[PDB]
Ligand binder design. Sequence first.
Ligand SMILES: [Zn+2]
Ligand SMILES: [Zn+2]
Ligand SMILES: [Zn+2]
Ligand SMILES: [Zn+2]
Ligand SMILES: [Zn+2]
Ligand SMILES: [Zn+2]
Ligand SMILES: [Zn+2]
Ligand SMILES: [Zn+2]
Ligand SMILES: [Zn+2]
Ligand SMILES: [Zn+2]
Ligand SMILES: [Zn+2]
Ligand SMILES: [Zn+2]
Ligand SMILES: [Zn+2]
Ligand SMILES: [Zn+2]
Ligand SMILES: [Zn+2]
Length: 581
Amino acid sequence: HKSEIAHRFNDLGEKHFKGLVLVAFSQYLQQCPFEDHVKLVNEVTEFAKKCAADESAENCDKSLHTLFGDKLCTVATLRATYGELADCCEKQEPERNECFLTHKDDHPNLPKLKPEPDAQCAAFQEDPDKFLGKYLYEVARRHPYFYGPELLFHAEEYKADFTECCPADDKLACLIPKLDALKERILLSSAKERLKCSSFQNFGERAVKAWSVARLSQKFPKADFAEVSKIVTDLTKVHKECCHGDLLECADDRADLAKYICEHQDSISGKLKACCDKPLLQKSHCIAEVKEDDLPSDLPALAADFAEDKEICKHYKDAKDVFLGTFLYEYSRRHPDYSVSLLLRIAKTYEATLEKCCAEADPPACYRTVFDQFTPLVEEPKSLVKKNCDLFEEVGEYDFQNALIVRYTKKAPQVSTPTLVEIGRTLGKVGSRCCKLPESERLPCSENHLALALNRLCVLHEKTPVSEKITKCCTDSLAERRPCFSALELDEGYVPKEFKAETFTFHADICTLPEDEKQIKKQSALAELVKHKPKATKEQLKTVLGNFSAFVAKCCGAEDKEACFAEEGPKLVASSQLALA
Ligand SMILES: [Zn+2]
Ligand SMILES: [Zn+2]
Ligand SMILES: [Zn+2]
Ligand SMILES: [Zn+2]
Ligand SMILES: [Zn+2]
Ligand SMILES: [Zn+2]
Ligand SMILES: [Zn+2]
Ligand SMILES: [Zn+2]
Ligand SMILES: [Zn+2]
Ligand SMILES: [Zn+2]
Ligand SMILES: [Zn+2]
Ligand SMILES: [Zn+2]
Ligand SMILES: [Zn+2]
Ligand SMILES: [Zn+2]
Ligand SMILES: [Zn+2]
């Protein structure tokens, strides 16, 4: 094509093209106010219309990267608001784009977008096109690596809720349930795509490929290997592009894959019929979130082709990567009950056994029992999940969260308290999600979502590194990541953090906070007790936090609140010292 911007405008249409460009600009520039990005989006779209009518007109032949990066660099207040981001404009492509990507903020710390139902409907009434457009902007800047086409879909969910619910009598009780369910979908989606970009950045395509091969084979067991290879190749490209900012190519390539999957749906999966007669946004999303199809009845034991076939060392020698992919395809489709990282763990073992056995004198007799090395690999995650789920059921979410905060704080006491509270809190929600499921679904829920939380920690750690052992767990191997964090224990040579009274001094401003923030304030205190007294047992810690809870409720009920906090605070501090000894 002469003009790639023409090609994408034609392919995507004005509305989607607009929506993506707004998401792009809000991810690279997370602070500048709404109306500013609206102007930029408008100018790009105007220019895109100039190029589709005349593919030959000036600047239309330039690359999407050149055009987008040039646009960012002509923003007034770029240096004033974004500081070092302006230094990226001195670089030429492709180093200019890498520079912008590395300055995206994963913890921008913006005001929590609370659902104010009466206040929102009035904004929805006054300016609806701005209301849909502002949702995209607010979610984009909060989540900079969020899958662009994915955000459009969820933005369409947001206006469908508000149009429906606003004119009813009970405006709030129609909305708050629907919006709080949307929030949890955004958090999960952001987490999933962030792991994809993290994977490219620290491991490359080959690791992303194995991950997708394994997941898609579970998703589509009836699909043949050539079909799975095709989708994987196509999908890996979509993610590289979305992860790299190529937001228009991302969306375009995604649509082509959806069309493809739907045109080959009998060959791929019976669960796709519902998806495949929907409008294109909804069709893409449905395919991405489709359930795992039924396991076909006619599958032969893996043993014949992978332990028993005598010519495997020749097979392995001729096409190493293609042959292990076959193994991974065949193993993953039979085991929808296994987590993805576990499947990669197993496949790594298979690869490594073939290297030692084919080097040895007699391979067929050696590798005949390679499947026996997987038995311990499966029992290990099964044990972890059982133990956490029995704990979660025994004690409830809040306490389970606190247990994890104590656990992870002991593992890595150099990590910041906000980060430790975030991980413990998130992992407790995972317990609510996964422990209630059947065992066929419980292991993979637990370990797949645990991988998301550990990636979040790793991403914050790459930003502001504090611990070598965390760095090793985050950089060494994606498959072995969860095992690596599990193997962390408190160091014998960790020096208890110095006591600061202010750190355990509460005030009456806690009383006017919402419960979630009230808890965070209390859970932060928990982490700080551990950092200060790392050899205190979980049972000593639970008792002292209980006394802090009683102190906070007592004084928040009192008529003179700040005088209560003043009298009772110091007493509780000094007795807690003796309690934690
Ligand atoms: Zn082209
Ligand atoms: Zn053309
Ligand atoms: Zn579209
Ligand atoms: Zn570079
Ligand atoms: Zn968010
Ligand atoms: Zn989604
Ligand atoms: Zn990259
Ligand atoms: Zn995707
Ligand atoms: Zn690119
Ligand atoms: Zn053979
Ligand atoms: Zn899940
Ligand atoms: Zn290393
Ligand atoms: Zn306070
Ligand atoms: Zn509370
Ligand atoms: Zn002390």
